[PDB]
Design a protein around this ligand. Structure first.
Ligand code: HEM
Ligand SMILES: Oc1c(Cl)cc(Cl)cc1Cl
Length: 137
C-alpha cells in the first residue's frame, strides 16, 4: 500500500526521483521552462548534471517525509505550510503540483510494480487542497 510505496521509493530514491521528474517534464514541456538549466537537455544529459540529481533527490525526500507524516493520505497542515512558504516556491500555483502528481501516478500505473496508484492520486489531490488551504494560488 501507500506506506510500502514510501519504503520502495526511499530504497532507491534518486532513481525514482529522477525517472518521475523526467516523466513530469516530458509529459508537461511548459513546466521545463521554469528550470532554466534543464532547457535543451536530454534525459541522459540531465542525469549527468549534479544539481539535477541532487535537487530531484531533495524534492522527493521532502515528498516522502510529507507522505510518511500523512494520515490516510491526508498531509499535515504544517507540511502544506512549509511547501507554500518555501522561497523556492513563490512562483508556483497548485496546478504545478497537480501536474507532478498526475505524472507520478501515470508512472506508477505503467511500472511493473504493485504501487498503490489510487492512494497516490488521492494523496496528490489532498496535498493540492492542503496547499490551497495554506494559501497557494
Ligand atoms: C510535493 C511536491 C514538492 C516538494 C516536496 C518540493 C520540494 C522542494 C525542495 C526541497 C526544494 C529545494 C531543492 C533545492 O534547492 O535543492 C524545492 C525547490 C524548488 N521547487 Fe519544489 N517541491 C515540490 C513541487 C514542485 C513543483 C511542482 C515545482 C514546479 C513545477 C517546483 C519548483 C521548485 C523550484 C523552481 C525550486 C527551486 C529552488 C532552488 O533553486 O534551489 N516544486 N522544491
Ligand atoms: O533543480 C530543481 C529540480 Cl531538478 C526539481 C525541482 Cl522541483 C526544483 C529544482 Cl530548483
Amino acid at each position: 500500500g501507500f506506506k510500502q510505496d514510501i519504503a520502495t521509493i526511499r530504497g532507491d530514491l534518486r532513481t525514482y526521483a529522477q525517472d518521475i521528474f523526467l516523466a513530469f517534464l516530458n509529459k508537461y514541456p511548459d513546466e521545463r521552462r521554469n528550470f532554466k538549466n534543464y532547457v535543451g537537455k536530454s534525459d541522459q544529459e540531465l542525469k549527468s548534471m549534479a544539481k539535477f540529481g541532487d535537487h530531484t533527490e531533495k524534492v522527493f525526500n521532502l515528498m516522502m517525509e510529507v507522505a510518511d507524516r500523512a494520515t490516510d493520505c491526508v498531509p499535515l497542515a504544517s507540511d502544506a505550510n512549509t511547501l507554500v512558504q518555501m522561497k523556492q516556491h513563490s512562483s508556483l500555483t497548485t496546478g504545478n503540483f497537480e501536474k507532478l502528481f498526475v505524472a507520478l501516478v501515470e508512472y506508477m500505473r505503467a511500472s511493473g510494480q504493485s504501487f498503490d496508484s489510487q492512494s497516490w492520486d488521492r494523496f496528490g489531490k489532498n496535498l493540492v487542497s492542503a496547499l490551497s488551504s495554506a494559501g497557494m494560488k
